[PDB]
Design a protein around this ligand. Structure first.
Ligand SMILES: NCCCCCC(=O)O
Ligand SMILES: NCCCCCC(=O)O
Ligand code: NA
Ligand code: NA
Ligand code: NA
Ligand code: NA
Lengths: 378, 378
């Protein structure tokens, strides 16, 4: 058993509705107003073919930028300097207001929600995960602290296979006989040697954070993400997040939103944690994110080869470079890149053919760093 | 085999992507921008509990209207007189701009798209279905004309079981071993005694119409619905439609939209087929819808008990009453009701516990008729 979870709707029984019961009362009143949460659905456009390139002033400094963006399968690119959009690019077929999957950039959003709850005193990072999710007793999450989950410093046997099993349990792939029923169940099956302290990137960690969020607030993660973050950004559009059969949002990588709206998250980070709709996280939380995690814990050569003094903390990758760059990162080329020096945010949403290779990583970081430097006063 | 179908995206192979291949190239470029079409997803609100009742002037004539709406599980109710919204009601928990499943009201939208193509001469209702979908040869749709599909005058062995099998084939319910792979396949399995001329309500008919639309335009039904109808309404929001594993929209009942936007469809019908974005259908098509179908074909006592001179044509129910009322209808209480006498449109979106009973039918029609009469000059 995985304990109490936020009901899909007020008064809903556990796990209700399912694909086979949503047309039945009392589920249908809710389902008829949220069918996309139960059945794959397409948008029928209210609006009746070429790339949109508005690189602005950085074009003179980076003449081959558009070509570089094309080479890295860029779908949406936006540079926010201060409160102003100074550069934009959208591939042919992708509108400026279209939403794009964030993959692991979603993790940085989840960490932000956790941070908001820490500020309220509803979550103490020093406490063990089991203080909030007792049902994780007996799993690899039995012993580690919430902060160790936030910093991903837990050794886990996660063949990266656990990765595909995670997808199947969440609805991202077709289920196989015997698979865990939902994401909560999947998490309870995870094991490790018990060691902690060393960084190990594992998407299961973020879903555990979302589970903690649900237990401390009583809200579905989808709602918590809106209440604690999205609804305070004065966003142009709602964001979306895939949900599993219980309605649990895929916190580790299922959020989709527009490039301009994702930039509002970065703006909030560079504004000390304050957004137009109110404070999202404390100044202290933002400071800790920008400061970075323990360098000694970071042993991922894939990251340190490029960023020797890099680290990871609270669901954000910290380059530790001369500019103090920090970034949310997702496979296939997603970045919510922060450049505090120039008070700028760079959003790059892409679709590389591969989830990750040293090649794409090199090209992508080259673009983000060049764009950042192009914003420097001269 | 079911022949050629519109690709999910430009250059996509047949049936691609699937739930197991959307993360792979070249599918991912498209999938990352339309993930809701592959995996159930929830909205993360950009906006930070009580019913909204603005019955306007009809309140004096119908003092117990709100209670009557509550009794019929009303979620959204809107009255458009001319070009003005004169009355509105939304249950607690349902915002004015929230979308609601239309169920079979979706059929009237599909018929409108077919009508647009008839005007262009791309579809001749007198032609057999097989003239456009040869793959339907050998099925109950081998012989009947497109008009007979439009008027639902084809005898079909459709246990209403075929009804649940239809849902499973489309993704509305969990698949069973042996089920047709998609909606197209399901349609080809349908049989009948060969007789025609008598009305038989069957949702399979509308999906055949959508299939014809795809074969004549080369567009996915989802896109055709936008291009030929939705994008010309100057709608506030996009509509949505559930899609099966091939991306085929559930034309017979999977569309969702706001009450105000659905009213724009009625406005177009009362405006001779013209919408703000251009003509949707010809004046003649609208005239034929308002005129009704053959009364002799209408043998559904469930309809004629209330509307003795009623009929059905081109995916619309025609009451044949003294007011000439015509309406799009969907199970659980959905209506796109037209009252030409007062140049008004009444939209009622509900969630009755039951798909249909004489009881709900009586109460619902009582409300629509009373509201219509309340709009009469006095
Ligand atoms: N297992 C689905 C992918 C989750 C996102 C992971 C990442 O972007 O690093
Ligand atoms: N089989 C799903 C329901 C389809 C809608 C049918 C109707 O509204 O009459
Ligand atoms: Na904080
Ligand atoms: Na990694
Ligand atoms: Na027409
Ligand atoms: Na019927």
């Amino acid at each position: 058993s995985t304990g109490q979870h936020p009901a899909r709707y007020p008064g809903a029984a556990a796990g209700e509705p399912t694909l086979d019961s949503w047309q039945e009362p009392p589920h249908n009143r809710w389902a008829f107003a949220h069918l996309g949460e139960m059945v794959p659905s397409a948008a029928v456009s209210r609006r009746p073919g070429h790339a949109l390139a508005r690189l602005g002033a950085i074009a003179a400094q980076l003449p081959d930028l558009e070509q570089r963006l094309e080479q890295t399968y860029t779908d949406a690119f936006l540079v926010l300097r201060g409160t102003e959009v100074v550069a934009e690019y959208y591939r042919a077929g992708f509108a400026p207001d279209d939403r794009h999957l964030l993959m692991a950039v979603s993790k940085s959003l989840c960490g932000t929600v956790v941070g908001a709850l820490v500020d309220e005193g509803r979550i103490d990072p020093a406490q063990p995960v089991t203080e909030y999710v007792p049902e994780l007793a007996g799993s690899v999450y039995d012993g580690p602290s919430v902060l160790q989950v936030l910093d991903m410093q837990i050794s886990i046997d996660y063949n990266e296979s656990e990765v595909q099993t995670h997808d199947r349990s969440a609805g991202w792939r077709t289920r196989r006989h015997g698979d865990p029923a939902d994401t909560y169940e999947f998490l309870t099956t995870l094991r490790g040697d018990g060691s902690t302290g060393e960084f190990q990137y594992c998407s299961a960690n973020t879903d555990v954070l979302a589970w903690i969020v649900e237990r401390v607030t009583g809200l579905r993660y989808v709602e918590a993400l809106s209440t604690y973050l999205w609804a305070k950004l004065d966003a142009d559009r709602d964001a979306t997040i895939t949900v599993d059969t219980t309605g649990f949002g895929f916190a580790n990588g299922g959020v989709s939103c527009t490039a301009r709206d994702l930039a509002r998250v970065g703006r909030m980070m560079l504004d000390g944690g304050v957004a137009p709709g109110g404070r999202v996280v404390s100044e202290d939380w933002v400071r800790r994110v920008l400061a970075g995690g323990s360098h000694e814990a970071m042993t991922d050569k894939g990251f340190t080869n490029t960023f020797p003094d890099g680290s990871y903390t609270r669901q954000w990758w910290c380059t530790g470079n001369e500019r103090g760059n920090v970034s949310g990162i997702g496979i296939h080329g997603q970045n919510l890149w922060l450049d505090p020096l120039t008070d700028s945010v760079i959003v790059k949403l892409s679709s590389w053919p591969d989830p990750y290779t040293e090649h794409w990583h090199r090209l992508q970081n080259g673009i983000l760093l060049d764009v950042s430097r192009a914003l420097d006063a001269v």
